[PDB]
Design a protein around this nucleic acid. Sequence first.
DNA 1: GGGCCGCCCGGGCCGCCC
DNA 2: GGGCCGCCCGGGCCGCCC
Lengths: 200, 200, 200, 200
Amino acid sequence: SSSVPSQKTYQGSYGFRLGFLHSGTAKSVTCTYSPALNKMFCQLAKTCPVQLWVDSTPPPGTRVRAMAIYKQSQHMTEVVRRCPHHERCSDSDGLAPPQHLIRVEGNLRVEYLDDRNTFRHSVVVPYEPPEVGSDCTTIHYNYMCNSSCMGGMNRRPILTIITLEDSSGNLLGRNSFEVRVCACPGRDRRTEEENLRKKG
Amino acid sequence: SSSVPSQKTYQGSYGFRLGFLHSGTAKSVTCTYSPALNKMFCQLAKTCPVQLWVDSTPPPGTRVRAMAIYKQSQHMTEVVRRCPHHERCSDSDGLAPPQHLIRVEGNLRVEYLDDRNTFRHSVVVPYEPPEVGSDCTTIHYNYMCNSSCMGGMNRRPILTIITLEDSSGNLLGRNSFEVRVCACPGRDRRTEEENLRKKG
Amino acid sequence: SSSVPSQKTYQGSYGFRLGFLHSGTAKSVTCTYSPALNKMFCQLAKTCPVQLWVDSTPPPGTRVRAMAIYKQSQHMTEVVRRCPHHERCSDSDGLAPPQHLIRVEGNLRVEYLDDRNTFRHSVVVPYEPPEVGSDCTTIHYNYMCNSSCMGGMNRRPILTIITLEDSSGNLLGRNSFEVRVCACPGRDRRTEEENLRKKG
Amino acid sequence: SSSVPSQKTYQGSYGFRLGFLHSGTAKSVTCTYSPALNKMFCQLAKTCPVQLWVDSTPPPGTRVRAMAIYKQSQHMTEVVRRCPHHERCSDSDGLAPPQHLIRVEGNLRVEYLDDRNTFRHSVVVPYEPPEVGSDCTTIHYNYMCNSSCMGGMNRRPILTIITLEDSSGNLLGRNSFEVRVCACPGRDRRTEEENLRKKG
DNA sequence: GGGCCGCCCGGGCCGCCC
DNA sequence: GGGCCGCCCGGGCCGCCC
Ligand SMILES: [Zn+2]
Ligand SMILES: [Zn+2]
Ligand SMILES: [Zn+2]
Ligand SMILES: [Zn+2]
């Protein structure tokens, strides 16, 4: 069986999709999302709000998992991890293992997992339905390396795969988006969108 | 579950809303409220009158809680607290813990709380209905740091979240407003309203 | 007896004077010295090289002490200390008490002292004569607060007093210089020198 | 006493000086030396031949030590070491500790040392006099990180300090040169020499 | 050899003195 | 009320792809 998790969109029977805030492209905005590229541009260790939208209410005990894979076929089989420099940084919140790229902040029930067969990292929180009058629930993710980090992602693009899973382990829905963690998200989003228009 | 309290307005079945006095924008007025920005501008440790308005009378034992959160997504998970300088100031009224930003003055039944899971501070008083002939009840809040304080809010905007809660802990209503604690509330309100008009 | 150490220059029988490197006034240079003002401009926690020049060799066991006092008569009696914010910072090198403003880096025999009568802080290293062919010895000082720090120096200028002391405690020589610890030493040096010329 | 080794040239009673090969400035030459800058430009882990020249023959048991320090006063006190990424690389020759920046290749009597007081690294070989008819002896040094390495030198220039020491520990001579380890030594030497001419 | 991403840089934007 | 210091900001400056 494959050791590479699927990235295939599966909005499923609950109508699961992601949403992202409108942030603009000021040069050093902390986080911004390109709909044309389905790509988040964000700064190291800065809050990245991701909205969970469903048409139908998931069952009690549903979980939300996030995991990173390399986007390019050439690198898919390599586990996405923090680089050695940032791994040794004294920046752990007391729960995230220092090797994990993706953290969740602001959640009292976060779980960090290492797959015993694929060695891949993931971070899980319970799914909570929106407040009355609200249409979505927001998770604050953090990416703890730049895409460029030597000895880590080393300029290779990643996908974040968000899965909605019931307590039994059934896949209720899947979505994914590309991530670039970089110093100047607004500059780099504009550059990549312009290159898409000019040369894509 | 989230460690960030919701800011979502919930005027609820009792028709709960806040009111603020008309104060003007003389440069150093002690407290002034901008309806356009839903924002209070006030000076450190000065009285900030907040009115509670309801259409229907809350049940006996209802309580009024105030808590601060950072407004920006990037800072929401950080607990709002006093800076180290003002924390060591001998300005405690004998009841407020020195780390708490928000105090209530002039109430014999004030309670200061530290959440055992989120570590967030709040201050609670009993809800009292208006006097006959009066349409609202007023609480005098104090903010014990400037928004700019180094090692505390450090120029980051906060929201104050006011909740009306029954004795059992049900949320009866919720309102919130932005706060800037600053040396010159009248100047800064005018500046922010003008920037809204010109560049918002 | 006075609790304020003397600032009076005493170059003494060994011909003791200080020297400073030529650094220029690029806006954010880390450290720069104004001869006209006898004033060092430097950034928080950045190396400040100070040269010790003597005409005659001090005796074995000579010590070099540095201490800060407020320059203005109105503040001389207050002990110069780190502000509460930086005092709680996890920036101690394992030897300097967190309250001390002045540190010495790169010396295996540094001693930090608190005066039991005046409560004033000082930092001492052994005097070592220059290498053959060299005319001076250099100490790397660090200032661990900005001059502007709220709850610390709070925009008040300080003097650093450097004393050459024999092992018995005799004062062999004294020199002093003004210090401004600031974000932009080059800007601020130029500003202060221009104000001296225009308005001094 | 200082934890920073002296860089002061001391050609001494044996007339000790260094020599470097003429290599040119082809863009990616592996190693090239700028006399104007007293600076070696070389690639990671590539051979850097350094010549030892003496006028008088050192005594038996003389040793040659190489050590790196940061050139800028602001960084002198920090120990120069390999970055975390290259430290975990399986590139050890069986003798050099993985944390050491400077290695010697091609010598059966190399010794790697960690100073118990300063924690600084050095690498030592016995001094051997030139062959009859030869005027110098050559040591092949290797630098195991780029000057730019994140978490290591991080774009900060270093000096290599070469000391000639007798077996008793007397300093017989000292020389030093700046090093830049980089991808394109020929480009970067030309750039730095041109900037010296134009803006130095 | 030509040329394409983190960070440095001078310009300019909130408590307190007058 | 007028006006005088830390930090944000867009412009632009080294390993690696071609
Ligand atoms: Zn990293
Ligand atoms: Zn404060
Ligand atoms: Zn301070
Ligand atoms: Zn390296």
